[PDB]
């Protein structure tokens, strides 16, 4: 996250860190029940050096605050049993960029490990609304990742505006969230993590999943996120959640 700040410990207890074997933190995810995480499909596609689609290649860390302290009290390490990537996911456009990760053994809920609520299909996150991205991704464009989880406040952008800021790249499954002025954005290593939204009454819903962007924090180039409300039934169908 560029232009953010350190999270308070336990502030985002649904944020998960996904490490690939021999590589450390690669992607974020979010805890939606004791057994299931939500992440981005593009994180789990093989490349020439490594089978990212193979659930055996991954370790999830729940309750993690600091990447240098993976054995801190409250950190929970879990293997993955299964990766369900959305069947319509397109590798080129990142349309339908969502995946569900099944833990081999369940999360134990605590001060540091708690699920985030899923929005119904009808749930509106209006243009202009301040919401949050979190992650251990790069903190400056051209820079490096964070040891301490970062949070950034960004605003939902109108879909027509989003479509024309990134011409011929935006589908109805996507949302732009950020600023026309740049400054605050997700960045490399934030992929798969949650967009968290606080409602007027204080309830927190997951609005989206960090998907892609043209650079980070640049003018007229807000980060792109998978809209979660559209996937409510699909999540229920595949997980029971």
């Amino acid at each position: 996250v560029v232009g953010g700040t350190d999270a308070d410990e336990g502030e985002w207890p649904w944020q998960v860190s996904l490490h690939a074997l021999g590589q450390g933190h690669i992607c974020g995810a979010s805890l939606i029940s004791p057994n299931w995480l939500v992440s981005a499909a593009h994180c789990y596609i093989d490349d020439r050096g490594f089978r990212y689609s193979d659930p055996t290649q991954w370790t999830a860390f729940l309750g993690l605050h600091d990447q240098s302290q993976r054995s801190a009290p409250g950190v929970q390490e879990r293997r993955l049993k299964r990766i369900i990537s959305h069947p319509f996911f397109n590798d080129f456009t990142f349309d339908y960029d969502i995946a569900l990760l099944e833990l081999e053994k369940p999360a134990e809920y605590s001060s540091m490990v708690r699920p985030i609520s899923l929005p119904d299909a009808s749930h509106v996150f209006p243009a202009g609304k301040a919401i949050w991205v979190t992650g251990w991704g790069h903190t400056q464009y051209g820079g490096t990742g964070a040891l301490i989880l970062q949070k950034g406040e960004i605003r939902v952008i109108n879909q027509t505006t989003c479509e024309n800021l990134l011409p011929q790249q935006i589908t109805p499954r996507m949302m732009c969230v950020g600023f026309l002025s740049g400054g605050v954005d997700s960045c490399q290593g934030d992929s798969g993590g949650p967009l968290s939204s606080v409602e007027a009454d204080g309830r927190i819903f997951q609005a989206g999943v960090v998907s892609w962007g043209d650079g980070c924090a640049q003018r007229n180039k807000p980060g792109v996120y998978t809209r979660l409300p559209l996937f409510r039934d699909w999540i229920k169908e595949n997980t029971g959640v």
Partner: antibody
Amino acid sequence: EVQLVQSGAEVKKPGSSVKVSCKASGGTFSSYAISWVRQAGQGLEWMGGIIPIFGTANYAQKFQGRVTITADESTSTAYMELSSLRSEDTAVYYCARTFHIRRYRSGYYDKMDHWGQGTLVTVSS
Amino acid sequence: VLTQPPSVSGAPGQRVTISCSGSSSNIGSNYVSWYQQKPGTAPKLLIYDNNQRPSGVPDRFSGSKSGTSAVLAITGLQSEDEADYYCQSRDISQYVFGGGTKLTVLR
């Protein structure tokens, strides 16, 4: 496994044009870009590139004007045409396939991982 | 305009570093990659995004960046590392290479 195979060496009279091709052996460019780089003996020089499936060419300033870069996903072949050839254009021209065009927030032209074998263009009469 | 020393030397086993000096519009604002070119061979990507090593690149290669400079370190160099090494960065809307550094192995 990906392999890019380039067209044969050419000899071109100064002032002529050359069009070098670069075929992706697997029949598809998939979600990757093609970048063109030459080695004229002084060091590597970026010429430009294009995403073949989503094609609008990007060019290096030095070669703006004289270079045209195209690509056809159906024949999985990319092309670089260099016109008004100079003696100093005597070089080995490489095409290279980049990383995935959307996986890295930093982009792709700086991530050239699969290289063609090079095409020698000798500019001489 | 990325500047590299034209020549660096080290003996087998030695650690050597190869510097790439740029400006705000390139290295200062962007990630740096590094490439090796062995004689008579197409270039090979060693490092991207400042310090990331693709699979099939020897562990002895590493990268760093600070401000408007970047460095490739070859730790434990061997006789077969005799080659030219190039840094690469975006510069505004184009990509640029450093002038290249030839590694001489000391004997």
